[PDB]
């Protein structure tokens, strides 16, 4: 009965911070509310009868001051300061049961005065003039609470991004990148290195709102909005080649070399992700030197992930006001994802032309529908599945019915079905399930557009 | 020593009855001193228990005994029992809870009535307690995904009843004793209202009902002017003199009734007192339920349900604003904020009451439920979520609840409802067919708090946003507005008029309120499994194929979690994928267990249900390597390395000094979570789904 009393406080002292909301950064949170009230009671009416003390000092110090670590300035303050009262065993004949709480006592009372203070002496927060103050002062090395009063007696004093600087110790940064990084590639690097990658392609999504103190996620690169996620960039935007800082920056050391092809296992796609959110705020160089040919070699490789991590990149070579909006340079992503036949691929393939499909729009649009309803739609088991997935997937993004997403690309298809008629009598009822409507009903609605090429051509069918 | 275990490791890896012995062996040699010998004991049934050798509770019965001897040894026996736990997937699902519960009981009830013989006794609890006390079990059990579970408040139960043990002395002599209801006053007198200065009790101290004169029911009276809460404060000194403890929280409460009534059935005083009274009455309900409250929660619920009935034109507006009405008026926020709180508190108060309800023994329930109760509750739920009208976000989660809570005790004590009395398909079924259109709203992470069309996203726009009771559901801007309105001088009737004006710079409020809001759907989820267990599939419930909704809501992430979302570094990632994960066994019990769908044909979905398998199934080919897996961690997980590094910083685990042994299971788990982000166990269960029913076409996809 000596120990099971200390444990049941790290029983629930350690439980109710375990159900907190996380949030990670630099302030916890608490979901409940009454939890925090059926436990600092018996925090209060456990200490209070003052029993069950085996030296040690292991864990009521740390339990009293953990819970005040949640609590500090937050809303729970007065949650804390009616609930438990210290000033019933206050008791400072300079003497002061505990060692521990004099530091929490201290800042309750730090923060009370407000008005004047002091300066810190010892680089504390404001401290202020005592009767001595010096019971705080420095702490003795127990490891695990020796931090927790650290955390806690500085927290008077005055963000993400700025861990990765201070994680390897804005023209500065540039000039302290662009000279650092290339002495960091230099010498056998897979790690140190690709931090580097992503920090890259942050200032740029930093960068482009020159078109410091606090920022992170940028709104576009990182944030979901419910539209068509690719008609939010802009079209018109600046051109990557001498407006963008970064990109060149990484063009000359990661974009060249004879390693690109074959080195960088994982560190290949840290460019990746940096490049996209380049591109996302850089209308990107209309070949393409080497980037473009990553992508090829990029997409090509037999891995899974490193694959579908490059489907992402291609509609951002479609999208660009300028040179080639809706000119040849949509035809070469055509005919190169024309290109791949490969049993592997599969997938990428199908993900790829949806993209395509929703990045361009009026007559383009209508036309390249069409190619994927026309063959992927066909014959091939192995296909037809997936590509009845994703259009009616895409109907719930731009949110319309299939059939409503249709239209058009019916009055071209079903003069064809209706110039081989029964013959087939297989794509036609293979479609027919996708709109879902009964095939009495929508030939009967459409039946304007077959009779006149019906009867009369193709008459070895009467 | 080392050979038993290179040996064991060898044998493991290797591949019936052949370990049999060797677990049971294990299990001996588990029966040193040294850490680096047991900890591959136990590590060997994880590799052992890949096949069918869950099939009872002796694993746990061996559990049983390891834990207690040992009481860096917490999670030793959890996570590997959480391998059997998890294992759920119905019977075994049940009754593996059982095992656990008696295991409570019996050791707490013989715990009350304390040699050294039971000086452990109170061990064993060390132990039950430090092993529950979500991410690490979730096996069947008392179940909700955001708050309460009840094995949350029994908790309560014990931690308080292990308190007077304490006090007992160390020869039990003086016995001091409880302090009676000593507390229960002060409790009720100090209420914080969380967010708002002043409390309650005071801000009510300062209220006057006005163009009501004369107020009576029973030895309570209020008059003309003066304040409302002065005649409380009388009335519980009053019944503090002769009330019993547990009749006096009755007959107080069943006057707050008859008040707040005269005030809500309109005279033509503005409703001020309604939104505090009914906080307070929450105080009262949960204050130490025990047995206490009997009836005295159904005679607040029909009226509480009947009051919120009352009030509609605030949940019934209409959707779109027309064009013809321009918006220039006096723009007055404060005649909104009580039409809000008395729906918000309302529908807490009823979650209040169940979970409660959810406290009390084994065949009390059957009392409560009847054809009166709840008849009266479906004009509730079935006002809440519309599909013809504004959604509102705060009661939405407090409406399921609710039909979670009921769901989960159903099938707890036995002889459902009566033999399900009341409950009728017509009924039930719509309760569930308007869940339907809940799952196929999006939540972009961005989008919350803007302004838009329903059936988009759940918005939760930003003029109703406020902690309700239970739970603390968004940031809450305006949760010190509430103490605005009160004046705190003159003793006024009528709010102090607030403007909508100055009602509400950084976004990461958005992921919050989007992670919690995101709970929603890992709820709405343990609705189905307990729906699928009761009914036995008769009735037209599961015939009305989820497997259609369930699938066409698996697709869609597992198209947008892999194209639109992985890289970005956000919080929700590994919710949404532990999400998913879940979201298999919906289907594949469904599947497993049934296979006859009670609709014949599958081919409505048949498209989008191979897929589904199909992406699962592409892990089949399986960077393995290590130097890689932490190269994705900095691109991916960085935050979620931001928090398990701050744990062992500020708030320990009870563990971390220097587990180095454990130290590498810290080196396991981040790459499951470096795993299913980018995208096992699971992966032998989606092949099984596709084998057992074109095979021609069948080997396309297998050579795809």
């Known amino acids: 009965y000596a120990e099971i009393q200390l444990k049941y406080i790290s029983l629930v002292v350690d439980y109710v911070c375990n159900r907190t909301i996380s949030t990670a950064l630099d302030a916890p949170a608490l979901v409940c509310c009454e939890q925090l009230k059926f436990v600092l009671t018996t925090m209060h009416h456990f200490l209070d009868n003052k029993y069950g003390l085996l030296d040690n000092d292991p864990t009521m110090a740390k339990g009293i001051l953990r819970l005040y670590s949640l609590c500090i300035s937050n809303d729970f303050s007065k949650c804390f300061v009616d609930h438990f009262p210290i000033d019933q065993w206050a008791d400072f004949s300079q003497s002061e049961t505990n060692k521990a709480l004099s530091i929490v006592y201290f800042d309750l009372k730090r923060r009370s005065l407000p008005v004047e203070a002091l300066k810190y002496d010892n680089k504390f927060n404001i401290w202020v003039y005592q009767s001595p103050d010096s019971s705080l002062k420095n702490v003795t090395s127990p490891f695990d609470d020796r931090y927790k009063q650290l955390e806690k007696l500085r927290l008077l004093v005055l963000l993400l991004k700025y861990r990765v600087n201070q994680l390897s110790p804005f023209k500065l940064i540039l000039n302290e990148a662009s000279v650092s990084i290339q002495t960091c590639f230099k010498t056998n690097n897979i790690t140190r290195l690709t931090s580097w990658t992503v920090i890259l392609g942050r200032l740029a999504c930093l960068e482009s709102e020159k078109f410091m103190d606090n920022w992170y996620v940028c709104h576009l690169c990182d944030i979901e909005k419910t539209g068509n996620p690719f008609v939010r960039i802009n079209p018109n935007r600046p051109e990557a080649a001498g407006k963008s800082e970064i990109f060149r920056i990484l063009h000359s050391n990661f974009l060249s070399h004879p390693n690109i092809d074959e080195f960088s296992e994982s560190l290949l796609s840290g460019i990746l992700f940096s490049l996209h959110r380049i591109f996302s705020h850089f209308q990107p160089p209309k070949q393409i030197n080497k980037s473009f040919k990553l992508v090829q070699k990029c997409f090509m490789n037999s891995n899974r992930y490193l694959r579908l991590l490059s489907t992402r990149i291609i509609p951002l070579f479609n999208i660009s006001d300028s040179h080639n909006s809706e000119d040849e340079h949509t035809a070469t992503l055509i005919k190169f994802l024309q290109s791949q036949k490969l049993p592997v691929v599969k997938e990428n393939l199908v993900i790829a032309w949806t993209q395509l499909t929703l990045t361009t729009s009026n007559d383009v649009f209508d036309t390249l529908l069409l190619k994927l309803i026309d063959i992927f739609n066909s014959d091939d088991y192995s296909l037809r599945i997936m590509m009845t997935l994703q259009i009616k997937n895409m109907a719930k993004i731009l949110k319309k019915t299939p059939y409503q997403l249709l239209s058009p690309i019916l009055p071209v298809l079903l003069r064809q079905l209706g110039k081989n008629l029964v013959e087939r009598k297989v794509g036609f009822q293979n479609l027919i399930e996708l709109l879902g409507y009964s095939s009495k009903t929508i030939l009967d609605i459409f039946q304007r557009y077959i009779i006149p090429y019906a009867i009369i051509q193709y008459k070895s069918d009467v | ?704």
């Open chain 2, 1 to 704: 020593r080392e050979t038993v275990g290179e040996f064991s490791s060898d044998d493991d890896d290797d591949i019936g009855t052949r370990p049999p012995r060797f677990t049971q062996i294990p299990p001996s040699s588990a029966a040193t001193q040294i850490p680096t010998t047991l900890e591959v004991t136990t590590t060997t049934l994880n590799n052992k228990q890949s096949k069918n050798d869950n099939q009872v509770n002796q694993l746990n019965k061996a559990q049983g005994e390891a834990s207690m001897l040992r009481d860096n040894i917490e999670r030793e026996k959890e996570k590997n029992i959480q391998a059997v736990k998890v294992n759920e997937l119905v019977k075994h699902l049940q009754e593996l809870a059982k095992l656990k519960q008696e295991l409570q009981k019996l050791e707490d009830e013989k715990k009350f009535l304390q040699r050294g013989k039971s000086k452990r006794e109170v061990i064993t609890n060390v132990k039950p307690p430090s092993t529950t006390l979500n991410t690490i079990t979730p096996d069947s059990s008392s179940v909700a995904i955001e708050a309460k579970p009840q094995s949350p408040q029994s908790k309560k139960r014990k931690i308080s009843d292990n308190l007077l043990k304490k006090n007992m002395v160390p020869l039990n002599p003086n016995r001091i004793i409880p302090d009676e209801t000593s507390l229960f006053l002060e409790s009720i007198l100090l209420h914080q209202i969380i967010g708002a200065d002043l409390s309650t009790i005071e801000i009510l101290n300062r209220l006057k009902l006005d163009y009501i004169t004369e107020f009576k029911f029973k030895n309570f009276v209020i008059a003309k002017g003066a304040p409302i809460g002065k005649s409380i404060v009388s009335l519980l000194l009053r019944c503090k003199k002769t009330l019993t403890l547990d009749r006096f929280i009755d007959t107080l409460l069943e006057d707050i009734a008859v008040l707040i009534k005269e005030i809500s059935v309109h005279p033509n005083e503005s409703k001020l007192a309604v939104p505090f009274l009914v906080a307070l009455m929450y105080q009262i309900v949960q204050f130490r339920p025990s047995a206490t409250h009997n009836l005295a929660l159904k005679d607040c619920f029909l009226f509480i349900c009947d009051l919120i009935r009352i009030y509609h034109h605030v949940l019934k507006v209409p959707i779109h604003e027309s064009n013809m009405n321009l918006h220039v008026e006096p723009q007055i926020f404060q005649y909104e904020l009580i039409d809000y709180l008395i729906i918000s508190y309302s529908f807490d108060l009823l979650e209040g009451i169940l979970r409660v309800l959810q406290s009390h023994p084994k065949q009390t329930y059957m009392e409560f439920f009847d054809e009166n109760i709840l008849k009266s509750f479906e004009f509730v739920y079935k006002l809440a979520l519309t599909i013809s009208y504004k959604p509102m976000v705060n009661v939405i989660f407090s409406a399921v609840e609710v039909v979670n809570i009921i769901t989960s005790i159903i099938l707890n004590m036995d002889n459902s409802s009566d033999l399900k009395s009341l409950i009728s398909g017509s009924w039930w079924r719509d309760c569930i067919t308007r869940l339907y259109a809940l799952l196929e709203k999006e939540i972009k992470s961005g989008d919350v708090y803007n302004e838009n069309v329903d059936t988009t996203t759940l918005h939760m726009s930003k003029y109703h946003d406020f902690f309700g009771l239970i739970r603390n559901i968004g940031d809450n801007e305006l949760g010190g507005l509430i103490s605005k309105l009160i004046y705190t001088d003159r003793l006024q009737s009528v709010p102090r008029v607030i403007s909508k004006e100055d009602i509400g710079t950084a976004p990461i409020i958005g992921y919050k309120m989007e992670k919690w809001l995101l709970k929603l759907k890992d709820e709405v989820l343990n609705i189905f499994e307990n729906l699928l267990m009761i009914y036995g599939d008769d009735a037209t419930i599961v015939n009305g194929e989820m497997l259609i909704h369930s699938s066409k809501f698996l697709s869609r992430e597992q198209a947008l979690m892999i194209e639109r979302y992985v890289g970005q570094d956000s919080p929700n990632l590994d919710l949404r994928c532990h999400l998913i994960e879940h979201t298999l066994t919906i289907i594949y019990r469904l599947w497993k267990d049934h296979f006859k769908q009670l609709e014949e044909q599958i081919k409505q979905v048949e498209s989008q249900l191979i897929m589904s398998l199909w992406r699962f199934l592409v892990c089949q080919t399986e960077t393995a390597n290590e130097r890689e897996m932490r190269d994705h961690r900095h691109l991916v997980d960085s935050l979620h390395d931001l928090t398990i590094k701050d744990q062992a910083s500020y708030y320990e685990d009870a563990f971390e000094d220097l587990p180095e042994y454990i130290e590498e299971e810290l080196k396991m788990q981040l790459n499951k979570r470096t795993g299913r982000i980018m995208q096992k166990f699971q992966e032998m269960a989606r092949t099984i789904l596709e084998s057992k029913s074109t095979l021609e076409e069948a080997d396309s996809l297998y050579i795809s």
